[PDB]
């Protein structure tokens, strides 16, 4: 369809063996927790996934115990809410998608767990969308609950612009400029959509080193066992 | 199987042991000339279909864009 | 030439050298490879 195509940004993980910047993933998780978690869900990400990536065991335990999670039927036979555990997943904003429709003027905020993977050119798109709430031009008019984001399909995203400069304060203190926040949350969402990005690239580096060792050696063995024929000299000697 | 495959006569066939001969005799010495020899016997049969695929692909893209580009005369 | 006559000519020894080498190769490869990956990122 007719849509603005987000440009290519020089990400720190854009390279072939380039891993993710984990401080940026920590800052983007803070951005999600303070801003994006009010409407969007992360159903396939738990707190224990943050251990060894952005936070330690005790920091992630404190982060999990900051929230409340209904957990099981009491012996008395009823529900109850408990502080989150490292095994708890990220809390739902709404109990069901129809509540999300009712609370967001008919629009459904999608799962942001795989948003980067699910959106064509996601990392860019995300950054662009979050930073692309430009004014609608003449000739186009949008109804309430809509915003002209060139990048968003149709340029009418129900989501209002969620990142105002200094929307939240980074604990690290890095200036919380809108951009610094959009880049951090794009790195984090990326991490979310692929927690193994780093581990894999290490496997790929070992694979390239092993193939660079093994391909000329197997080629040399093949050319040994095929030299015999490749030197064979045929001669026709009719008895004449 | 072997032994009953074919009937040849008076065709002597000499050969050498693998360990007795260089592994890559003149590999880049003649390999390059040969690879180049090869490419010039097949390039005229292979390449021009893919060249006109590239032209048709670009053309389609650009034509499509122009198609999408608003008609200035229209709406005025 | 000595090596061939010692660890590469008898197939049993050929296997021995292979297995033993592989046992250590992993240590070296992993170590070296990791160094590189870390340096890169």
């Amino acid at each position: 369809d007719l849509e603005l195509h987000p440009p290519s940004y020089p990400w720190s993980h854009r390279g072939l063996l380039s891993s993710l910047d984990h401080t940026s993933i920590r800052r983007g998780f803070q951005v999600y927790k303070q801003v994006c978690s009010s409407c969007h869900s992360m159903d396939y990400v738990a707190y224990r996934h943050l251990v060894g990536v952005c936070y330690t065991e005790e920091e992630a335990k404190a982060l999990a115990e900051e929230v409340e999670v209904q957990d099981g039927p009491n012996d008395d036979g009823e529900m109850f809410m408990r502080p989150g555990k490292l095994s708890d997943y990220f809390p739902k904003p709404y109990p069901n998608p129809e509540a999300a429709r009712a609370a967001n003027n008919g629009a459904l905020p999608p799962d942001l767990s795989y948003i980067v993977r699910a959106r064509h050119g996601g990392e860019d798109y995300v950054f662009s969308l979050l930073t692309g709430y430009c004014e609608p031009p003449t000739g186009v008019s949008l109804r309430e609950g809509l915003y002209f984001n060139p990048y968003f399909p149709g340029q009418a995203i129900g989501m209002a612009p969620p990142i105002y400069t200094e929307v939240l304060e980074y604990d690290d203190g890095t200036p919380a400029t809108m951009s610094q926040v959009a880049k951090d949350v794009a790195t984090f969402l990326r991490w979310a959509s692929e927690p193994e990005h780093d581990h894999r690239k290490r496997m790929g580096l070992k694979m390239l080193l092993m193939m660079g060792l093994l391909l000329p050696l197997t080629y040399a063995m093949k050319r040994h066992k095929w030299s015999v024929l490749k030197s064979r000299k045929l001669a026709y000697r009719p008895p004449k | 199987e072997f032994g009953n495959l074919a009937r040849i006569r008076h065709v002597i066939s000499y050969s050498l042991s693998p360990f007795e001969q260089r592994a890559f005799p003149s590999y880049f010495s003649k390999g390059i000339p040969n690879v180049l020899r090869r490419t010039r016997e097949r390039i005229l049969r292979v390449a021009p279909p893919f060249v006109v695929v590239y032209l048709i692909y670009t053309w389609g893209n650009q034509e499509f864009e122009q198609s999408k580009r608003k008609n200035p005369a229209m709406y005025e | 030439s000595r090596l061939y006559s010692l660890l590469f000519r008898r197939t049993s020894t050929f296997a021995l050298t292979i297995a033993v080498g592989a046992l250590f190769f992993e240590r070296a490869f992993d170590q070296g490879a990791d160094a590189i990956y870390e340096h890169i990122n």
Binding site: S231, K233 | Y14, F19, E20, Q21, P25, S26 | S1
Partner: peptide
């Protein structure tokens, strides 16, 4: 007969002596 010709030259193939065989 079988002696009219000699084995063709493999010099461009042959490497450049049991002494060496062990290494080879």
């Amino acid at each position: 007969s079988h002696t009219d010709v000699k084995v063709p030259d493999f010099s461009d193939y042959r490497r450049a002596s049991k002494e060496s065989s062990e290494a080879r």
